From a paper:
Upon dissociation from the Fo domain, the F1 domain can catalyze the reverse reaction, i.e. hydrolysis of ATP driven by rotation of the central γ subunit inside the cylinder comprising α3β3. The catalytic sites are located at interface between the α and β subunit in each catalytic dimer. Here we describe catalytic intermediates of the F1 domain in FoF1 synthase from Bacillus PS3 sp. during ATP mediated rotation captured using cryo-EM.
Two 120° structures were classified according to structural differences in αTβT. One 120° structure, termed step-waiting, has a more closed αTβT than the second, termed 120°. The αDβD dimer in the 101° and 120° structures can be described as half open (αDβDHO).
Residue numbers in the entry:
A (entry chain A): 24 to 501
B (entry chain E): 1 to 470
C (entry chain F): 232 to 471
D (entry chain G): 230 to 284
E (entry chain B): 128 to 377
F (entry chain D): 232 to 352
Write the structure that this text describes.
């Protein structure tokens, strides 16, 4: 019989051709002689084309290929929490096997048009700039885009850390990263306690191209298991650009015709399939949701590139980070001008909503006037007030590494900045003022803190004014 | 026989072998139905579209869904006709999926319902209308400066959050109210959440009872995304061919249709054209667009949104699409933030209909005079900042005074804008709006406050508003 | 045609004028037929044997000891792309070239020869003469400087250029116009009869323009005339 | 004093409109560069496709 | 036959008879003679079809047969053009050949040859014919589609190698026969649609390299009130002038 | 060279320095091998396997418990084009980058390191 076995006839560059396998299904998993997995991708008339998912140097012509009877799937379950794992579900941290009893296929239809609901729940990233300027709702997918070494990974790690007390599960998918980089990220997560609810999927640069092509789909498949049970999931794809490069390599090895800018024809379809599976389920399906944060790396800040344009066309917004802002000491480096969230703002809480507009206006104003910087004093209204308030806004929006802060404290400090309690404070002392203000709040303003935390609304304005005045009474400028 | 077997599966492309003398025709539909005999199989329900005859009694097809689980040797059944979707009254208020199968939970459609083929040659030269006619939308800006044509194609452009969706809803409402027609919305390769939002907004506005929706969004295969437009068009064609109505057809993004066609061509293996597009780009666009024409007994007019890659209007896909367009309406975030609705740019909008032969000498003169006035105001807006308001001449002051009232009178109150504003809508006939704009031009209303023109229907309502104000 | 000319070159020792109306069509036809012969396509779709096929033809058109052949060829440039392989390969086969330009054709200065892209092997001091060589080089230098000034002129305006730059522009526009000429065969398009200008007249006129003699005449006086005296005649008709 | 201030105003407006002209030219030239490069991209794609097909 | 050899070198005569188009901006400064082939080139929505329709209508007095060939045009547009011709009475001497955008590529490829073969019948009887090709760019696109479907390697801008031969073979049949061949003539007015006025594109340059001149219509002029949109900078007639009446020439 | 260097940290536990003359020529050689084998060229003619080749080269230069390897690599940028695929895919593996300028070299300032284009984690 040759119905459940086959022999390889060609091996090259991770692509294998086998004779036989009469009953193999399209998209199935197959077993090589030495323990390496593969996909039966193309079922031709006389032979089967197999994409190898491991070291292919151990495969020669003539060795047997065994069938498995399972369309490619990944293991799922709560047992994956706190472990780093390859795209196929094999653990890579040691610590023994991951014991799970359920699976879910890598390819799965996205939720239908009638299965979805409008996004209405905030997702607190713990970053002042993101939570104020570009709010993110649960079930939204938002693009994070920038150049090399601009802080995208730091933003993702901070967002994942901030979700500790929230009822969310986080998934970190690293594509094309260095193994030492992934190791360091995992160590920071363990140090800050995020591994109690986080799954890490890793596919390093030394891996075969199909594994990099498959990693984000495995991450989404892991997330969907929790999503359809009624939970909330946050998924991060670290490099869609590198996933696209791996897919281009695979397509060229299969000898498919190129497309625009040498990328394959269905490059848009790839990311559409990937990012369409994140949604907010309606009440009939259980109020689950999956939110995605795809990453795209630009070249010298060029947004008009093919992949950035495709992803911007797919997602519901973008967060743009600037190399010049990053180099000039503005470390979150978020450019609130180009950045915009289309579905968010509805999910933003009322306390932040009532105060975000004035800060938006101030930060927008203090960008054009920076052109008129060579001369100091044109007008008191144009230069003095606008420039001082803008500089103080830029100072407050700065943030340190791996230190998220709660939404109520963000709301209070933004209110203090907007209403003018920072008008008579020097720029250089604003960060110390903010830090001592948070400590003073912890010391005395638990009533305001709990009022915000329960009502999602601003407390009494006069009481807030007197509390901030009481703090300023003690704060020393030096 | 009318039975075949699968011999090749390569992604969305499936090859099927039939008995000699029993091959199906091109564009026919084939069904695969399978029950898992044992644990090493999965249940399959799939539809295939014939694309080529490869020879040796083999037929190459394109699947309308995922081809996972297919096994070389599965039985295939020939339906003897292209894809057929239900048509008629039953399609109003329902949502379909390109195969004609409903998506919402109102239930299935009975098997005795009439179904029409997806593919069909365009109407003959004999059956077309001999004269050009104007579709009265009832919106002042469109009816004055960018008229629509029965059987014409209109390109819609605008940024996010300017009013495209509310404008579409108002167009459907006005057409259904006055001209007695219906509308068909066909999304093509767009966001599923956007489709759900549009469904909910239509239900809220009450427009949903007079429209049909087919979505086939981004996550669908290229085979489905390439035929969503055709199935929407074939459900639209029924009312024009059989009931003689005037119908609207909305295509969410025509560019995704071309992109899906290119993706399908790459799988078929044809040689790429200029910029990677399919060699059959012009032919496919012609076969889609040429079916939207006015006939002796009815008409279909289509509002289409067109995405332009890299903002390059010389790219092959926008270049091919633009050759079919008859008009263009552009939205302005500046007008939207100023508070002018429906925020249509009165100078960026263009139309082939605005000619003395078609629209009339009086209408043409009024429209051209309005455009000249607005252009002069645009020029003077620079001199206002250069020198100052008082430094301008008296005739320039009169021009500005007329221009403010013109620009405000271009606005209108929509029926579907009641949910926001609290004010009922207005349907303004073209003769009435021409008379009102002539009266504003002639200086009959220079004494009225300029804010009484802000958001209003006919010209008599303007003087009523001024009377109530002062 | 080349075979017919070669007999007069060889068997009779006679001077031959050979005119080829468009030599590019030869390589175009070769490229049209190359695909059907089974050859793989080269860059921008031409045949792999573009250089050898053209060389085997071009090297037959030469002057030998027994007879001389002087040949004038028109070489079409597809889509105004001078980097196209067919125009690029034929450059090495020529002794003197003149590059016509659509930009100069559109401004109305015929024959619209590019005064800087055109080159000849005979422009040497010991072949044409010291005065001719110096005048030609000075004209080319002035035209190149005017070409370089075209961004600063467009942006900052003519007023802010220095004293010398304004003089360079003033001389350069008049030189560019005086390079135009009225042709005998162009009398079908215009009533102007045309002229034949000797080399001595051309050199003396350009030298006089360079020395600043005629800076007081308007620019339009220099368009489509022959000798330098016709410029004075046209200016006097204009009223000077 | 009046003439000195007039000189300041004149130079300021001259620099302003010079900057405006320069940015207009930059817009035109950069957009020209961008229309040009797509032709090279399609040419190299055509060459790759032809090379694959001819074998 | 669709494919027929063109008249020879010694079969032709210099163009010396005016073709009165009835438009000042043409008959004054860009004259067209009988036997000439003049290119009409411009962007979309510029009046290219209107120029041809006016020229065809103006021929009622003259003894000339007109052929209007539409390649890739919208059927509604063709119907309206036919209705204007009927209203002005030009259907007494006009043949309309149509191949809309819904037709398969071979018919679009084939239409101009059918038109010129229909014209040759009257041309060789000693009569005068006028032929209008509404788009040669769409014929070129159809031929490119056909070549790529036949797997012929593409050249510049994916067009095949003989994209020049196609148009030259088509347009070389327009000629002014001599008294020995009968004195008949055929006049051609091919159309080319440019993109953003790029006169340096491959197909516009190929077609310019064949015809006896070009009439350039500018969208910048067409908008803002210059409705005939003639651009005297890029418009010229290489054979005209010798085929212009003495008064107008004077 | 990498195989010769790995031994000192594997069997002897040393700290070794691996100096690579030019990565650009390594990528060019890879592209030549791919074109000889007949694969379909990538973006600007490079091999499709460029990223995987670069990863399989660089990923073995890592610090472990026994020892560490640190690498100083020289990169050549053709016509100042930093968008070129070889430098572009090399950037993803570097902890510190240094940019050298002929502008600084002409003035006489050696080593001609640009003090603003150089970054380090
Ligand atoms: N808010 C911050 N405060 C201080 N340092 C920061 C901050 N954000 C980022 N950094 C530092 O800036 C550098 C940017 O590294 P990061 O991994 O965040 O960037 P990246 O965009 O993911 O880049 P890469 O392409 O190199 O992976 C790191 O050294 C990080 O520690
Ligand atoms: N006629 C109107 N009357 C009142 N408000 C209006 C009107 N038109 C638009 N708006 C306002 O503008 C908003 C934008 O509506 P709409 O969804 O139609 O915009 P859009 O430009 O199509 O946006 P998107 O790109 O998100 O689909 C509305 O929600 C409403 O607040
Ligand atoms: N002389 C004229 N006077 C007034 N309107 C004119 C004139 N010539 C053309 N038009 C108008 O120009 C518009 C388009 O003209 P026409 O259809 O001839 O253009 P075209 O270049 O053939 O367009 P297309 O690309 O659609 O084929 C029509 O509205 C027509 O009425
Ligand atoms: Mg990173
Ligand atoms: Mg919308
Ligand atoms: Mg036309």
């Amino acid at each position: 019989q040759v119905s459940d076995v086959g022999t390889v006839i060609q091996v090259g560059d991770g692509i294998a051709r086998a004779h036989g396998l009469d009953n193999v299904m399209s998209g199935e998993l197959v077993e090589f002689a030495n323990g390496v997995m593969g996909m039966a991708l193309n079922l031709e008339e006389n032979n089967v084309g197999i994409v190898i998912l491991g070291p292919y140097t151990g495969i020669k012509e003539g060795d047997e290929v065994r069938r498995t009877g399972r369309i490619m799937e990944v293991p799922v379950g709560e047992a994956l929490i706190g472990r780093v794992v390859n795209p196929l579900g094999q653990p890579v941290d040691g610590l023994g096997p991951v014991e799970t009893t359920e699976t879910r296929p890598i390819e799965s239809p996205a939720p239908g048009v009638m299965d979805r609901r409008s996004v209405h729940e905030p997702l607190q990233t713990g970053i002042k700039a993101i939570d104020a300027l570009v709010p993110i709702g649960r079930g939204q997918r938002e693009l994070i885009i920038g150049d090399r070494q601009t802080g995208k990974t730091s933003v993702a790690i901070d967002t994942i850390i901030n979700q500790k007390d929230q009822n969310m599960i986080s998934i970190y998918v690293a594509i094309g990263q260095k193994e030492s980089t992934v190791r360091t990220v995992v160590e920071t997560l363990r140090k800050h306690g995020a591994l109690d609810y986080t799954i890490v999927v890793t596919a390093s640069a030394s891996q075969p191209a199909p594994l990099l092509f498959l990693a984000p789909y495995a991450g989404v498949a892991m997330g969907e298991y929790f999503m359809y049970k009624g939970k909330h999931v946050l998924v991060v794809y670290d490099d869609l650009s590198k996933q696209a490069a791996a897919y281009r390599e695979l397509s060229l090895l299969l000898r498919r015709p190129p497309g625009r800018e040498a990328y394959p024809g269905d490059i848009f379809y790839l990311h559409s399939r990937l990012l369409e599976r994140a949604a907010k389920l309606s009440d009939a399906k259980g109020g689950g949701s999956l939110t995605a944060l795809p990453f795209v790396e630009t070249q010298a800040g060029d947004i008009s590139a093919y992949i950035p344009t495709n992803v911007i066309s797919i997602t519901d917004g973008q967060i743009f980070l600037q190399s010049d802002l990053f180099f000039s000491g503005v470390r979150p480096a978020i450019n609130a001008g180009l950045s915009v969230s289309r579905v968010g703002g509805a999910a933003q809480i009322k306390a932040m909503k009532k105060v975000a507009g004035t800060l938006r206006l101030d930060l927008a104003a203090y960008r054009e006037l920076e052109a008129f910087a060579q001369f100091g004093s044109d007008l008191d209204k144009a230069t003095q007030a606008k420039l001082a308030r803008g500089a103080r806004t830029v100072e407050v929006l700065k943030q340190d590494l791996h230190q998220p802060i709660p939404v109520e404290k963000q709301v209070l400090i933004i209110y203090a900045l907007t209403r003018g309690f920072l008008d008579d404070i020097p720029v250089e002392d604003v960060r110390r003022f903010e830090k001592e203000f948070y400590l003073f709040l912890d010391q005395n303003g638990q009533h305001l803190l709990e009022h915000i935390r329960t009502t999602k609304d601003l407390p009494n304005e006069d009481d807030l004014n007197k509390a901030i005045e009481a703090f300023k009474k003690t704060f020393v400028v030096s | 026989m009318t039975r075949g077997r699968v011999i090749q599966v390569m992604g969305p492309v499936v090859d099927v072998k039939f008995e000699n003398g029993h091959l199906p025709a091109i564009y026919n539909a084939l069904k695969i139905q399978h029950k898992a005999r044992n644990e090493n199989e999965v249940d399959i329900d799939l539809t295939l579209e014939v694309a080529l005859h490869l020879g040796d009694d083999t037929v190459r097809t394109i699947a309308m869904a995922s081809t996972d689980g297919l096994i070389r040797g599965m039985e295939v059944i020939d339906t003897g006709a292209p894809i057929s979707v239900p048509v008629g009254e039953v399609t109003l208020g329902r949502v379909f999926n390109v195969l004609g199968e409903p998506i919402d939970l109102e239930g299935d459609i009975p098997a005795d319902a009439r179904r029409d083929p997806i593919h069909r040659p365009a109407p003959k030269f004999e059956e077309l209308a001999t004269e050009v006619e104007i579709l009265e939308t009832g919106i002042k800006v469109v009816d004055l400066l960018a008229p629509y044509i029965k059987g014409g194609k209109i390109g819609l452009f605008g940024g996010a959050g300017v009013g495209k969706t509310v404008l579409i809803q108002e167009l459907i409402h006005n057409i259904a109210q006055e001209h007695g027609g219906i509308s068909v919305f066909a999304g093509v390769g767009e966001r599923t959440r956007e489709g759900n939002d549009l469904y909910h907004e239509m239900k809220d506005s009450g427009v949903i009872s007079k429209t049909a929706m087919v979505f086939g969004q981004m996550n669908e295969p290229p085979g489905a995304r390439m035929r969503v437009a055709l199935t929407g068009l074939t459900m639209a064609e029924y009312f024009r061919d059989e009931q003689g109505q005037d119908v609207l057809l909305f295509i969410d993004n025509i560019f995704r249709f071309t992109q899906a066609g290119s993706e399908v061509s790459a799988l078929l293996g044809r040689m790429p054209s200029a910029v990677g597009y399919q060699p059959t780009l012009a032919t496919e666009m012609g076969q889609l667009q040429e079916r939207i024409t006015s006939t002796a007994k009815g008409s279909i007019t289509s509002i289409q949104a067109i995405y332009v890659p890299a903002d390059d209007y010389t790219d092959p896909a926008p270049a091919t699409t633009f050759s079919h367009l008859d008009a263009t309406t552009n939205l302005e975030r500046k007008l939207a933030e100023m508070g002018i609705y429906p925020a249509v740019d009165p100078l960026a909008s263009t139309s082939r209909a605005l000619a003395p032969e078609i629209v009339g000498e009086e209408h043409y003169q009024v429209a051209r005079k309005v455009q000249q006035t607005l252009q002069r105001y645009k020029e003077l807006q620079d001199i206002i900042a250069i020198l100052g308001m008082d430094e301008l001449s008296d005739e320039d002051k009169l021009v500005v005074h007329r221009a403010r009232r013109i620009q405000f009178f271009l606005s209108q109150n929509f029926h579907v804008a009641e949910q926001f504003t609290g004010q009922p809508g207005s349907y303004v006939p073209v003769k009435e709006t021409v008379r009102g704009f002539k009266e504003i031009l002639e200086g009959k209303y220079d004494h009225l406050p300029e804010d009484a023109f802000r958001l209003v229907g006919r010209i008599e309502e303007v003087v009523e508003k001024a009377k109530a104000m002062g | 045609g080349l075979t017919m000319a070669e007999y007069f070159r060889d068997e009779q020792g006679q001077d031959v004028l050979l005119f080829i109306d468009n030599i590019f069509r030869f390589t175009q036809a070769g490229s049209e037929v190359s695909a059907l012969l089974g050859r793989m396509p080269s860059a921008v779709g031409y045949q792999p044997t573009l250089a050898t096929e053209m060389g085997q033809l071009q090297e037959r058109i030469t002057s030998t000891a027994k007879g001389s052949i002087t040949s004038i060829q028109a070489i079409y440039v597809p889509a105004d792309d001078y980097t196209d392989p067919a125009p690029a390969t034929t450059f090495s086969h020529l002794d003197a070239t003149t590059n016509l330009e659509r930009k100069l054709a559109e401004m109305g200065i015929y024959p619209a020869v590019d005064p800087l892209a055109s080159t000849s092997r005979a422009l040497a001091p010991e072949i044409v003469g010291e005065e001719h060589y110096q005048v030609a080089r000075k004209v080319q230098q002035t035209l190149q400087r005017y070409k370089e000034l075209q961004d600063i002129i467009a942006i900052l305006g003519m007023d802010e250029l220095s004293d010398e730059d304004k003089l360079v522009v003033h001389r350069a526009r008049r030189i560019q116009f005086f390079l135009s000429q009225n042709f005998h065969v162009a009398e079908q398009f215009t009533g102007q009869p045309g002229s034949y200008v000797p080399v001595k007249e051309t050199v003396r006129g350009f030298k006089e323009i360079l020395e600043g003699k005629y800076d007081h005449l308007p620019e339009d006086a220099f368009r489509l005339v022959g000798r330098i005296e016709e410029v004075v005649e046209k200016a006097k008709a204009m009223g000077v | 004093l009046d003439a000195k201030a007039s000189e300041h105003a004149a130079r300021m407006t001259a620099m302003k409109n010079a900057t405006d002209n320069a940015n207009e030219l930059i817009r035109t030239l950069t957009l020209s560069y961008n229309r040009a490069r797509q032709a090279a991209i399609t040419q190299e794609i055509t060459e790759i496709v032809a090379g694959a097909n001819a074998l």
